[PDB]
């Protein structure tokens, strides 16, 4: 009776069963400032949408200075969906639109807003860890509505019941939609609630995968598809190798391989690209907590929104460039896979992404439901709100609490005058800068695509989600379990799972 991971994350740490499990408070690297959970946070800086217009506005293409690909940030978005979800409660703190905003209030009605709901929170002890006494006299911490471990929840769901509805229960395989253009994920699966944020298409047309927001964009769904194909491929092998294994055993052995495949790409390919390198595994530490930190998911790792390019490229088998799909048209759009995943994959690995800086494309920052005065969303604003919702300390306060030296003037953050000016325009002091905008404004660390601050927060998180993981693939007991897997590089998984994909570079995150 071999022991396999749970679907929720609990049981991973023997001494602290719930450690890292779903629906548990986030960790803090730095004390939060009072965020007044039950009301609005007391913010003296400019509102989120103002900071968005002043700092994040983008009018031209910059292009990744590190020469990274769209596939790189598709994995980043795929990676975070394995780790953290800040699920909101019906606790409304709307985003105020400045009067006369050309994108959300051209008629100059100064009461226009964008929907925002504060993250689920729970009362915590005031004399434990890094918290703060809220303005109502109690201490609160935000709740991670997802397992903190990299455990394939993106494919298999967050519980037994959801998992056994996504899988065929035959040969240990996952349900799939067989089509004229390869195998695609399933649809209309009972018990698998899928997100429809943009609400362009009816939910019965969305694909049913282990992660609610899997339909967010097609490039994300494509990654889901290939790892599902690779899963059913391994299940057929284990079925032939071990005919005595029932459906449950073939599935788990296949699930175990895919989890290892996800982990290996992250720590052998993704992180060395993000941070320039990464130390080698040093063994499981039962005293390390793998739980996600509030600053990691809220602040540091949200850099990807800066790097998303405006267009999604499509290429055919013979290498011809097809009509690019603009991001704004791809939000929760299953039609993007009508011609299979191969045309997307080709575009993702060849097309260079956007630079990680203060600028965010307008597909994300100025997305509209229709006319310029009725509805829409601003991802830059949502991030600022979330940081202020969670009580992320100011830029210089965070650095101090991370063991870094605080900045003294604007030039200490960057030499680019236009960045300096936009910071002067948005904030009157460096000690008023939001950690999110400050870390983005920093110069990239040597060999990295992020600044010193974000570098430190990201490095600190992924050290723990590896060291604190009892089922980490590099541990002796897990090399034994996964002795018949076929874990390779991401580029080779693509070839294994695609039809006539064409040329694929070894590192699909670069060039
Ligand atoms: C649409 C969105 C994306 C691309 C078209 C996109 C992309 C990324 C990348 C590439 C990331 C990291 C490398 C990344 C990180 C995180 N995102 Fe995320 N993202 C899109 C849309 C959203 C939306 C909407 C949210 C929630 C907005 C809000 O906070 O109100 C979002 C969140 C995050 C996030 C926080 C994780 C969490 O706890 O939910 C990241 C670390 N992304 N995105
Ligand atoms: C808001 O913060 C300012 C200082 O940042 C403080 O003077 C003021 O009293 C605070 N307001 C509330 C309602 O807490
Ligand atoms: C905002 O509230 C309603 C929105 O329907 C609007 O009629 C009203 O004029 C606005 N309030 C102002 C402008 O003070
Ligand atoms: C093959 O290449 C030609 C050349 O432009 C292109 O028009 C056609 O769509 C391609 N068809 C494929 C790859 O099936
Ligand atoms: C915070 O605390 C309770 C414990 O009583 C949790 O069950 C729940 O998540 C709430 O939001
Ligand atoms: Ca950018
Ligand atoms: Cl500098
Ligand atoms: Na997880």
Numbering used by the authors: 21 to 531
Q: What did the study's authors say about this model?
A:
DdPoxB belongs to class B of the family of so-called dye-decolorizing peroxidases, whereas DdPoxA is a member of the peroxidase–cyclooxygenase superfamily. Phylogenetic analysis demonstrated that DdPoxA belongs to family 6 of this heme peroxidase superfamily, shares a striking sequence similarity to the mammalian heme peroxidases, and has a signal peptide for secretion. The metalloenzyme is shown to follow the halogenation cycle and to catalyze the efficient two-electron oxidation of iodide and thiocyanate. Summing up, in this report we present the first structural and functional characterization of a heme peroxidase with one heme to protein ester bond. Its high efficiency in H2O2-dependent iodide and thiocyanate oxidation and its expression at multicellular lifestyle of D. discoideum together with its antibacterial activity suggest that this secreted and highly stable glycoprotein acts in the first line defense of the fruiting bodies containing spores against bacteria.
